[PDB]
């Protein structure tokens, strides 16, 4: 059924969000960040004011 299909895509997305939520945050979201922690020249591409 169409509803079953929708539930399948929803389950896929819920799995993705599970892994993202458990996954350690990106460096930009870790609060304090030093040069060693982040990738080199990361600030150049990212738009920080």
């Amino acid at each position: 059924s169409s509803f079953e299909k929708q539930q399948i895509e929803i389950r896929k997305q819920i799995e993705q969000l599970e892994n993202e939520a458990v996954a350690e945050k990106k460096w930009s979201l870790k609060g304090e960040v030093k040069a060693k922690d982040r990738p080199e020249d990361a600030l150049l591409t990212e738009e920080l004011e």
Binding site: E40, D41, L44, T45, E47
Partner: peptide
């Protein structure tokens, strides 16, 4: 090998910079 990686990094930085402008 390393110098090639630095060259690629500079290329990527220049590309993003160009995209800003």
């Amino acid at each position: 090998t390393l110098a090639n990686n630095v060259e690629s990094k500079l290329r990527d930085d220049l590309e993003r910079l160009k995209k800003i402008r």
